[PDB]
Structure formats: structure tokens, C-alpha cells
């Protein structure tokens, strides 16, 4: 069984970017109450809709839209790094700042 990370353990500053476009990074704060800082608007360009909450899973992390249900999943690849697919088959990287 995978160890599920608590919101307190995931919280902090995270950098998002798409591979092949490393120069267009977003830095966003994930708060212990599972919300984002205002900079989460930066993800709008890749995701279309902006997430409003996040939820850890044992194997990754969900960014959940404003209706409380629609989601983008990212799989935990290594400590402090999640990866998911955006814009077709592009690779979105979420790494500790």
C-alpha cells in the first residue's frame, strides 16, 4: 500500500511547466486547506479551466475544478514531483519550488 501524503505535507510552493517549454513556468502556492494562491490562474492556459481545490491520492494528486468534481490527475513520479498530460500528449511537470 502506498503512503498517502497529508495536505500539510503537500502544501508549499510548487513550480509548473510543460516539457519542451521550460521557460514558461508558473509558481503557485498550495495551501494546507487544499486551496491555491491567486497565481493558480497561470495554469489556465494549459488546463482551460482553473482548479479551485486539490486533493492528494496515494499515487498522485488531483486538481479539482470549481464544480467540485471535474479534475486533472497527476501521478507522483518521485519525491516532490508530479507529472500529468495536458494539451493532448504534452507533459506537465509539477515540482517543489
Amino acid at each position: 500500500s502506498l503512503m498517502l501524503l497529508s495536505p500539510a505535507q503537500v502544501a508549499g510552493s510548487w513550480t509548473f511547466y510543460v516539457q519542451g517549454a521550460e521557460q514558461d513556468a508558473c509558481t503557485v502556492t498550495l495551501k494546507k486547506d487544499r486551496t491555491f494562491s491567486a497565481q493558480v490562474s497561470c495554469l489556465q492556459a494549459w488546463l482551460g479551466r482553473t482548479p479551485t481545490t486539490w486533493s492528494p491520492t496515494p499515487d498522485g494528486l488531483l486538481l479539482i475544478g470549481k464544480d467540485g468534481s471535474q479534475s486533472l490527475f497527476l501521478e507522483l513520479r518521485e519525491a516532490g514531483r508530479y507529472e500529468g498530460s495536458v494539451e493532448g500528449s504534452k507533459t506537465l511537470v509539477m515540482q517543489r519550488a
Binding site: 500500500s1 502506498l2 503512503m3 498517502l4 497529508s6 505535507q9 487544499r34 479551485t52 481545490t53 486533493s55 491520492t57 496515494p58 499515487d59 498522485g60 488531483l62 479539482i64 467540485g68 468534481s69 471535474q70 479534475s71 490527475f73 501521478e75 507522483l76 513520479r77 518521485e78
Partner: protein
């Protein structure tokens, strides 16, 4: 869907949406239920019916003190199960005993036993939140659960959460199930990308490491996801392959969902906010999936082995292989209700619903709103085994036969003329009963009959 109505295509899309086998899912082989059950049992480990009575009868103890040689194992500080851990573990054990011919009775190892199980906590992990041993091991029956001051998930198990699923999962190991792939927490960085088959996710088995979202299922509601507390579709098939199906469970008339008579926390819903994730095992009787309390659009399939989108989630409810569920109740959303080969009572409720009774004589209630009753084969509703549309509202509801006619229409006549597609519409005022008879084969007599409570008109029929 070629040459048919949108409403038929909606039914047909949904009935095929979760199809398994003989194709690729996420770049991996699609496994059927039976294939996944094979993979979940690939170790070949089992308990055996040592006392020869047709059943695996097992004892279990919550450890009160470290067992002899505990320090040898290097597990850190030992812990007895808390009251909450015991209660939730009893519920997890029950949900396995429900589906397969294995019994769990708390107590010490005794001469009648086919085996003995142990439950306790440890404090030092090399990566895993819990672990257990297969029933062919020397430590058969043992499962252990991690608790230290950086991991408290296992201190707070409850319905729908990961602590409770972990109990179900590790108990699954003690019964002879493996992870669906050769991976283990703490060994490298495993990924769904390297899974053996597409359906290795938490939508199909509590033994999977991988999020259901990988296969598209939405288990998130009101800002957070949930985890099945009880064995899922492939788990049920696997443990039944090992020890046999428990046909005694819920063998009378059972309601699942709202107004549940199942007496299980994971089968019970009591508000529109509930996050239901379950796979129905049922031994007999006339049974109902009651999802009336939800306002979200739902898609309900009564086919054995099939998945449903319930409560605003997708792919979160299923019926286990070998279970016949007879009735379904939609909610106030715009729903899809799909029957099976048995006589079904389908109730759409409020909203504009699409109903498919399938084989046999079904009693179909559209409810309020504009509902569509979908027909795919002539055998769906024959003169000797005919649907009754129990609340048909002419001028509002629709009867859709385009799965049969492929939009070649009907020839409405006073009396059959010997041609395929001749249709006779009648109304009997004393019974307030409409009749639609069709001669689809063209033999001069009806081979198709739908009875309606309330008049039915030619302009109520889509064909």
C-alpha cells in the same frame, strides 16, 4: 447508432462505454473481469478446506502484545488496534465474507480452524503504509498497518476513506490476492504507465495502486475524492474464483442506495452529497438500485458485470458478474435506465429520462417530464411478454423504435396488411390502455406489442 435516433445512440453509447477485452485501454491490453481475476490470483496461493465442509473457516486476533520475536523483524514500535481500527476491520472482513465462502470469527487459533489471522500496527516503514502475507507463506494470516507521527491515515479509517480501503486491501492479500501488477510501495517509483492491463485502477479493484481517474472515472464530489471500502468488481470475481460465491448473502429482496436494506455502510446513501463507490454482490431475490435521492444526471445499467454513473460521479457503481438485479430508480436528474433480460421495474423519476427495458416484459415508469422508452430488438416487447408503460403521457413522452427500424418508419394501418413495419394503434377506454402492435417480420400478425397506461398516439412514436 447508425440510422438511429439520438436517444438510442445515448443508450447504446452508455451500454458499451465500459466494455472490456480484445482492445487497448491507455496503451495496455484491456482485460475482462475473468482476465483480471486471473491476474489478481496469479500467485496460486490459497487457503484450504482442511476440515472438509466446503468453506474456509478462519480465526482472527487483534494482537495485544508483540508476538514472539517481533523485535527480530525490525518494524519499530508495536501498537494494538484502537477501538476504531477494530470496528472498521470487522466491517472490512464482513465485506469479504459477504461475497465468498470464507468466514472470519474472532478468537484464538483452534483445532477446527482452516487458519488464523492477526492484526496489529507497526511504526517504522521502508515505504509501505501497510503489508500482509499470502496464504502460502509461513506468516499466512498476518497483516500490519503503519502508525507513526508522520503517518496517521491508518489511525482514522472510515467509510469512503483510504484507511478503510487499506484494511480491505491488506485483508485481500491475506486471502490470496496480489497487486494487479508486479509492484510494491517502497520499491522504486512504480507507475500506471507500466501496468499490465488498462483496468488496473481503483475503479476495478481495491488491490490497484492507480487512481481511477487514469481510466476516466470521476470519483470526486464537492472538492475531494473517495475510495471504495468494499471489494470491487474484479476483487469479487477473484476471491470467488478461489473459494466460491456466497449465495446466502442478501438472498431475499434487497434495496441498494437510498432506502437501503443491505445493512452495509458502503451500500447506503442518505443525502444527495454522498459519494457512492461499490460493486453489488447479491445472492437472490427481487432487488432494486434506488438512486432517487440524487439530483445529478445518472446512467444506470442493470446488466451483470456492468458499470453505472451514479450521484454525479462516473463509473462508481457496478453489479458483480453472476448477479441479477431487477429494478432501478433514477433521481430528479435527466437519467438513463438500462434493464436486462429479466422483468424490470424502471422508474425515471422527475426530469427527462431515457428508459430501455430490454428482454422480457418490463414495467416502465417515465415519471414527470418528457421520457423516452427505447426499443432495440423485437424480443424486447412481444405480444405474450409485453412491456407496460405504467404512466405514459401522450404528447410528452416518446416511444422510440429506431434501434429496430433504423428510421425506416412504420406503416400505421387499421389492420395488418402483410408487410414489415405495419403498425396498429388502439385505445381501450375502460382500461385507459393504449396498444401499439407492430408486424416487424411481415407475417400479417403482430410480433411486437407495447401496452401503455394512458392513450398513445402515432405522433408519440419515433421510428
Amino acid at each position: 447508432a447508425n440510422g438511429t435516433s439520438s436517444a438510442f445512440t445515448q443508450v447504446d453509447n452508455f451500454s458499451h462505454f465500459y466494455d472490456r477485452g480484445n482492445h487497448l485501454v491507455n496503451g495496455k491490453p484491456s482485460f475482462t473481469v475473468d482476465q483480471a481475476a486471473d491476474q489478481l490470483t496469479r500467485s496460486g496461493a490459497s487457503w484450504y478446506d482442511l476440515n472438509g465442509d466446503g468453506v474456509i473457516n478462519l480465526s482472527y486476533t487483534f494482537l495485544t502484545s508483540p508476538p514472539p520475536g517481533y523485535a527480530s523483524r525490525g518494524l519499530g514500535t508495536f501498537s494494538s488496534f484502537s477501538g476504531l481500527q477494530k470496528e472498521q476491520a470487522k466491517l472490512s472482513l464482513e465485506s469479504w465474507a459477504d461475497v465468498a465462502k470464507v468466514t472470519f470469527t474472532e478468537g484464538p487459533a483452534a483445532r477446527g480452524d482452516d487458519g488464523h489471522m492477526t492484526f496489529a500496527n507497526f511504526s517504522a516503514s521502508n515505504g509501505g503504509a501497510a503489508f500482509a502475507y499470502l496464504p502460502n507463506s509461513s506468516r499466512k494470516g498476518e497483516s500490519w498497518y503503519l502508525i507513526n507521527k508522520d503517518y496517521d491515515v491508518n489511525k482514522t479509517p472510515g467509510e469512503g476513506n483510504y484507511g478503510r480501503q487499506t484494511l480491505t486491501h491488506e485483508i485481500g492479500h491475506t486471502l490470496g490476492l496480489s497487486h494487479p501488477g508486479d509492484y510494491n510501495a517502497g520499491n522504486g517509483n512504480p507507475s500506471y504507465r507500466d501496468a499490465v492491463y488498462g483496468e488496473d485502477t481503483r475503479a476495478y479493484s481495491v488491490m490497484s495502486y492507480w487512481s481511477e481517474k487514469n481510466t476516466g472515472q470521476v470519483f470526486t464530489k464537492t472538492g475531494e475524492g473517495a475510495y471504495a471500502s468494499a471489494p470491487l468488481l474484479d476483487d469479487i470475481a477473484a476471491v470467488q474464483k478461489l473459494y466460491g460465491a456466497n449465495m446466502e448473502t442478501r438472498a431475499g429482496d434487497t434495496v441498494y442506495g437510498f432506502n437501503s436494506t443491505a445493512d452495509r455502510d458502503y451500500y447506503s446513501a442518505t443525502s444527495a452529497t454522498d459519494k457512492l463507490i461499490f460493486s453489488v454482490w447479491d445472492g437472490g431475490g427481487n432487488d432494486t438500485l434506488d438512486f432517487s435521492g440524487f439530483s445529478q444526471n445518472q446512467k444506470i445499467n442493470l446488466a451483470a458485470g456492468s458499470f453505472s454513473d451514479v450521484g454525479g460521479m462516473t463509473g462508481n457503481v457496478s453489479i458483480a458478474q453472476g448477479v441479477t438485479i431487477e429494478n432501478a430508480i433514477g433521481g430528479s436528474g435527466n437519467d438513463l435506465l438500462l434493464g436486462n433480460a429479466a422483468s424490470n421495474i424502471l422508474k425515471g423519476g422527475a426530469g427527462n429520462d431515457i428508459i430501455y427495458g430490454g428482454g422480457g416484459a418490463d414495467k416502465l415508469w417515465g415519471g414527470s417530464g418528457s421520457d423516452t422508452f427505447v426499443y432495440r430488438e423485437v424480443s424486447d416487447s412481444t405480444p405474450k411478454a409485453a412491456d407496460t408503460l405504467m404512466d405514459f403521457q401522450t404528447g410528452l413522452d416518446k416511444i422510440d423504435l429506431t434501434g429496430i427500424t433504423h428510421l425506416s418508419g412504420l406503416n400505421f394501418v387499421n389492420a395488418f396488411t402483410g408487410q414489415a413495419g405495419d403498425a396498429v394503434v388502439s385505445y381501450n377506454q375502460a382500461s385507459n390502455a393504449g396498444s401499439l402492435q407492430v408486424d416487424f417480420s411481415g407475417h400479417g400478425v403482430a410480433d411486437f406489442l407495447i401496452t401503455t397506461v394512458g392513450q398513445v398516439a402515432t405522433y408519440d412514436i419515433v421510428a
